[PDB]
């Protein structure tokens, strides 16, 4: 009945427990101690963190709970406005943009993106083919080169040309710094203190970087396509008959450029990490890649046939879902789990990595990397596996991400053997989205021509 809560610090309430650069990992440790639900209060906000499938299945009932803008997401509205992921479900532009953009993620759209995804994937493989003997690969850095370029090209017919730069693209640097600031601002007792004026200035500078790139993309399109940008500019919502206005279009462009790259780069990076730490799994995945990818360019159908590679990616998303949060609020008063009364408006936060370690669902070996868990996906209980969120606010990009990641990981496993040459110790960096910081490998080419 009474809800668990970690210790408080006077008027700071629970906030000092989140003074860390790894908040999801810190909150997982609180869930370890307190169980499937605990309340957390800051001077500015209150939420309840959920970790069990039993309770999360209830939170995913859209007749009782709607998507909530949790604190860091509210901060991102300064950049993303009422773009798709940062709008309330009841905000006019959510359903409008959802209706206008959903056909850009049809299976037919995916088939149309395939050749562009191959273009960027081939650039990754060629970069690695061209390294010298004394070199290694910076894995998340190169995955982010690939995933930013892929959403640029597929979504906007724009080439970031990230493989032509040996430093991250400036859009990446500004994305990391802005999302890091949204993460950190949550932990500040007094965010309007002038101590944080320099953080505000930098956040505005990163916002201007993003908006300058949006201007270039828009100018490029004028000076040149059936893609996301086409639908932003020309589509009409079939419900309201209305188009997106120019202000919301700008928010959507930034929205898709950010969301289209970071979680997918983290996934590819974690997937490669788990493969080199589990060589027998790597061998099985590499065997599938060689058996299926018989042509120099993978076809759309061949990527759909990479079943074990798909299982590898799902299992990586099980252990470290790379956007590890989604938040709900109670639409009306209701009792959660038969035990915890909630009031209309009360916030819930789904701790996805902890959901994915629910032993009553997965068994006791929750920490083992075992892609065979996903051999028969219909055998996984409803709402036990939620790396893409829930309901009408689930990830619109889920099929895009998985097709890109399956294609790229398949080509990687076809073209190289991998060495964990530093015996890398997993260090998970959090800037809202997760990545294995510092993960490096050496690739030995299998000498298979493109
Ligand atoms: C493995 C990669 C990905 C993961 C783990 C992921 C995860 C998520 C999650 C958890 C949400 C729900 C957030 C919430 O409820 O507050 C979401 C929403 C979203 N994702 Fe992704 N995502 C991935 C890839 C992508 C890609 C490639 C795109 C774009 C092409 C994308 C665009 C979006 C957008 C626009 C939303 C908001 C949807 C809406 O509210 O209408 N994501 N994603
Ligand atoms: C806001 C957004 C959907 C929610 C994303 C956000 C990028 C950062 C992010 C990381 C997470 O760990 C949870 C999901 C969030 C909070 C995405 C940027 C554009 C998309 O609309």
Residue numbers in the entry: 3 to 226, 230 to 455
What did the published study say regarding this structure?
One of the most active CYPs is P450‐BM3,3b a self‐sufficient enzyme composed of a catalytic heme domain and reductase domain that contains flavins in the form of FMN and FAD for electron transfer. Reported here are P450‐BM3 mutants that catalyze the oxidative hydroxylation of six different steroids with pronounced C7 regioselectivities and β stereoselectivities, as well as high activities. Steroids bearing a hydroxy group at C7 have attracted particular attention, especially diastereomerically pure C7β alcohols and the respective esters, because they show significant promise as neuroprotective and anti‐inflammatory agents.
